[PDB]
Amino acid sequence: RSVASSKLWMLEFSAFLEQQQDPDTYNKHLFVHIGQDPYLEAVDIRQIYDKFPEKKGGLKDLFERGPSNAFFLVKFWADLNTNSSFYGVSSQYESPENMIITCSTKVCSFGKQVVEKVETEYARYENGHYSYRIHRSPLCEYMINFIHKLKHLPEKYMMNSVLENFTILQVVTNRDTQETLLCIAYVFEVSASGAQHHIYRLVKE
């Protein structure tokens, strides 16, 4: 129950490469994953502002409009050890309320948006709550190409150096009221362990 505001909780997230060996055989590799004392440490949001878009509607504007307790930083250690392909993303959210949500994902390079994906999701009542599922949303070509470039680098420290300027900002809004339900800033390194993560609350002071 880590990435959760008072209205929406992200239970699961994964980015993957699935390969069809034959009509009945598939192999799947997870690049990153979440959810496969719940106390979280805090990170001052001013430490990361220059790695995310910062004009009207940028991270600072979003954080200041609030609610600030919907803001999180996820550090990912991505697993790139992977040899008819489908690169996708899946995520699951739950809420006590029936809403229509919008998930906006901005891929950024040097703090500037390169691509934005916006998807609207409707609720399904399930086991006492409302559930929202983004199932096999295709990874953009920019990301697939970026993964291929990173794998051509001979050392993990070189991939980490390139990843230092790569970020993703995810903003989930209530479509009916336009309130921010969840906002997640993602930062990356390549794993030397498979995939790992660390979640923090974003605060100011």
Ligand X SMILES: C[C@@H](Sc1cc(Oc2ccc(C(F)(F)F)cc2Cl)ccc1Cl)C(=O)O
Ligand Y SMILES: NC(=O)c1ccc(OC(F)F)c(F)c1-c1c(Cl)c(F)cc2c1C[C@@](CN[C@H]1CC[C@H](O)CC1)(c1ccccc1)O2
Site string for its own copies, 23-52 (x = CB under 8 A): xxxxxxxxx-x--x----------------
Q: Site for its own copies (CB under 8 A): how many residues?
A: 22
Binding-site partner at residue 183 among its own copies, ligand Y, ligand X, none, CB < 5 to 8 Å by type: none
- Specify which residues 173 forms β-bridges with: 102, 180
Tokens in use for 174?
């209530």
Whole-number Cα distances in Å, 164 to 49, 62, 160, 174, 183: 14, 23, 6, 31, 20
Contact 110, 54 (CB under 8 A): no
Task: Determine the Cα–Cα distance for residues 133 and 10; give it in Å rounded to an integer.
Answer: 10
Nearer to ligand Y, 48 or 100 (CB): 48
Site string for its own copies, 165-184 (x = CB under 8 A): --------------------
Binding-site partner at residue 105 among ligand Y, ligand X, its own copies, none, CB < 5 to 8 Å by type: ligand X
The footprint of ligand Y (CB under 6 A) covers 43, 47-48, 51, 75, 77, 160-161, 164, 167, 187-189, 200
**Within 64-103, which residues bind its own copies (CB under 8 A)?**
79, 81
Task: Determine the Cα–Cα distance for residues 100 and 123; give it in Å rounded to an integer.
Answer: 7
Question: Phi and psi at residue 162, in whole multiples of 5°?
Answer: -70, -45
Binding-site partner at residue 48 among its own copies, ligand X, ligand Y, none, CB < 5 to 8 Å by type: ligand Y
Cβ at position 40, least distance to ligand X in Å: 18
Chain breaks in the chain (C to N over 2.5 A) after: 36, 83, 193
Binding-site partner at residue 30 among ligand Y, its own copies, ligand X, none, CB < 5 to 8 Å by type: its own copies
Nearer to ligand Y, 160 or 174 (CB): 160
Question: Phi and psi at residue 164, in whole multiples of 5°?
Answer: -60, -25
Binding-site partner at residue 124 among ligand X, ligand Y, its own copies, none, CB < 5 to 8 Å by type: its own copies
Cβ at position 194, least distance to its own copies in Å: 4
Task: Determine the Cα–Cα distance for residues 119 and 32; give it in Å rounded to an integer.
Answer: 20
